[PDB]
Protein backbone atom coordinates (compact mmCIF):
# COMPACT_ATOMS: atom_id res chain seq x y z
CA UNK A 1 0.00 0.00 0.00
CA UNK A 2 3.03 2.29 -0.68
CA UNK A 3 1.50 5.43 -2.34
CA UNK A 4 5.00 6.52 -3.56
CA UNK A 5 6.28 3.19 -5.02
CA UNK A 6 5.07 4.00 -8.55
CA UNK A 7 7.86 6.54 -9.12
CA UNK A 8 10.79 4.12 -8.88
CA UNK A 9 8.72 1.48 -10.73
CA UNK A 10 8.27 4.02 -13.57
CA UNK A 11 11.98 4.93 -13.50
CA UNK A 12 12.87 1.21 -13.86
CA UNK A 13 10.35 0.76 -16.71
CA UNK A 14 11.79 3.80 -18.53
CA UNK A 15 15.26 2.26 -18.10
CA UNK A 16 13.92 -0.95 -19.77
CA UNK A 17 12.30 1.14 -22.55
CA UNK A 18 15.61 2.97 -23.22
CA UNK A 19 17.36 -0.50 -23.54
CA UNK A 20 14.75 -1.60 -26.17
CA UNK A 21 15.97 -1.00 -29.76
CA UNK A 22 12.30 -0.23 -30.59
CA UNK A 23 12.50 2.99 -28.49
CA UNK A 24 15.31 4.56 -30.62
CA UNK A 25 13.10 7.04 -32.62
CA UNK A 26 11.00 7.98 -29.53
CA UNK A 27 13.99 8.73 -27.19
CA UNK A 28 14.25 12.45 -28.11
CA UNK A 29 11.81 14.99 -29.61
CA UNK A 30 11.08 14.41 -33.33
CA UNK A 31 13.53 16.39 -35.52
CA UNK A 32 11.63 19.00 -37.55
CA UNK A 33 14.51 19.28 -40.12
CA UNK A 34 14.08 15.50 -40.86
CA UNK A 35 10.20 15.81 -40.76
CA UNK A 36 9.39 19.47 -41.60
CA UNK A 37 5.55 18.98 -41.65
CA UNK A 38 5.53 17.27 -38.19
CA UNK A 39 3.87 20.19 -36.29
CA UNK A 40 1.17 20.54 -39.04
CA UNK A 41 -0.14 17.08 -37.94
CA UNK A 42 0.99 16.65 -34.30
CA UNK A 43 -0.29 19.09 -31.57
CA UNK A 44 1.89 18.12 -28.53
CA UNK A 45 5.32 16.52 -29.16
CA UNK A 46 6.20 13.91 -26.50
CA UNK A 47 9.24 11.59 -26.28
CA UNK A 48 10.71 9.36 -23.56
CA UNK A 49 13.44 11.80 -22.51
CA UNK A 50 10.74 14.42 -21.79
CA UNK A 51 8.75 11.81 -19.80
CA UNK A 52 11.86 10.82 -17.78
CA UNK A 53 12.82 14.45 -17.11
CA UNK A 54 9.22 15.28 -16.03
CA UNK A 55 9.30 12.29 -13.61
CA UNK A 56 12.74 13.15 -12.27
CA UNK A 57 11.75 16.85 -11.78
CA UNK A 58 8.89 15.70 -9.54
CA UNK A 59 6.30 17.03 -12.03
CA UNK A 60 4.13 13.91 -12.20
CA UNK A 61 1.68 13.48 -9.31
CA UNK A 62 0.57 9.94 -10.33
CA UNK A 63 1.52 7.16 -12.70
CA UNK A 64 -1.73 7.89 -14.63
CA UNK A 65 -0.24 11.21 -15.72
CA UNK A 66 3.01 9.49 -16.87
CA UNK A 67 0.92 6.87 -18.70
CA UNK A 68 -1.02 9.62 -20.53
CA UNK A 69 2.22 11.17 -21.80
CA UNK A 70 3.68 7.77 -22.89
CA UNK A 71 0.42 6.98 -24.70
CA UNK A 72 0.76 10.38 -26.49
CA UNK A 73 4.16 9.22 -27.87
CA UNK A 74 2.37 6.27 -29.45
CA UNK A 75 -0.71 8.19 -30.67
CA UNK A 76 1.60 10.80 -32.25
CA UNK A 77 3.41 7.99 -34.13
CA UNK A 78 0.06 6.53 -35.34
CA UNK A 79 -1.15 10.00 -36.44
CA UNK A 80 2.12 10.86 -38.27
CA UNK A 81 2.69 7.52 -39.98
CA UNK A 82 1.94 7.51 -43.74
CA UNK A 83 1.27 3.72 -43.54
CA UNK A 84 0.28 1.12 -40.92
CA UNK A 85 3.25 -0.89 -42.40
CA UNK A 86 5.80 1.89 -41.54
CA UNK A 87 9.07 0.83 -39.84
CA UNK A 88 8.86 3.49 -37.09
CA UNK A 89 5.09 2.94 -36.54
CA UNK A 90 5.69 -0.86 -36.33
CA UNK A 91 8.39 -0.18 -33.65
CA UNK A 92 5.83 2.00 -31.79
CA UNK A 93 3.27 -0.85 -31.68
CA UNK A 94 5.72 -3.34 -30.17
CA UNK A 95 6.99 -0.78 -27.69
CA UNK A 96 3.40 0.11 -26.75
CA UNK A 97 2.58 -3.56 -26.07
CA UNK A 98 5.68 -3.82 -23.87
CA UNK A 99 4.82 -0.63 -22.01
CA UNK A 100 1.17 -1.61 -21.42
CA UNK A 101 2.17 -5.08 -20.17
CA UNK A 102 4.48 -3.48 -17.57
CA UNK A 103 2.49 -0.36 -16.53
CA UNK A 104 -0.69 -2.35 -15.68
CA UNK A 105 0.59 -3.49 -12.22
CA UNK A 106 2.09 -0.02 -11.50
CA UNK A 107 -1.34 1.57 -12.03
CA UNK A 108 -3.25 -1.12 -10.16
CA UNK A 109 -0.90 -0.98 -7.16
CA UNK A 110 -1.03 2.83 -6.99
CA UNK A 111 -4.81 2.98 -7.21
CA UNK A 112 -5.13 0.21 -4.55
CA UNK A 113 -2.71 2.13 -2.27
CA UNK A 114 -4.74 5.33 -2.66
CA UNK A 115 -7.96 3.46 -1.89
CA UNK A 116 -6.35 1.93 1.24
CA UNK A 117 -5.11 5.41 2.29
CA UNK A 118 -8.69 6.81 1.98
CA UNK A 119 -10.37 3.68 3.50
Ligand SMILES: O=C(Nc1nc2ccccc2o1)N1CCN(C(=O)c2ccco2)CC1
Pocket residue numbers: 024025026027028029030031034035076077078080081082086088089
Ligand atom coordinates in the same frame (compact mmCIF):
# COMPACT_ATOMS: atom_id res chain seq x y z
O1 LIG B 1 12.61 11.93 -35.90
C1 LIG B 1 12.22 10.95 -35.28
N1 LIG B 1 12.97 10.42 -34.18
C2 LIG B 1 14.18 10.89 -33.65
N2 LIG B 1 14.90 10.42 -32.61
C3 LIG B 1 16.06 11.26 -32.58
C4 LIG B 1 17.18 11.27 -31.75
C5 LIG B 1 18.16 12.25 -31.99
C6 LIG B 1 18.03 13.19 -33.02
C7 LIG B 1 16.91 13.20 -33.87
C8 LIG B 1 15.95 12.22 -33.62
O2 LIG B 1 14.76 12.00 -34.31
N3 LIG B 1 10.97 10.18 -35.58
C9 LIG B 1 10.14 10.69 -36.75
C10 LIG B 1 8.61 10.64 -36.62
N4 LIG B 1 8.29 9.38 -35.96
C11 LIG B 1 7.09 8.72 -36.20
O3 LIG B 1 6.33 8.51 -35.30
C12 LIG B 1 6.81 8.21 -37.54
C13 LIG B 1 5.81 7.38 -37.99
C14 LIG B 1 6.14 7.08 -39.34
C15 LIG B 1 7.29 7.75 -39.62
O4 LIG B 1 7.71 8.45 -38.51
C16 LIG B 1 8.72 9.46 -34.56
C17 LIG B 1 10.23 9.55 -34.46
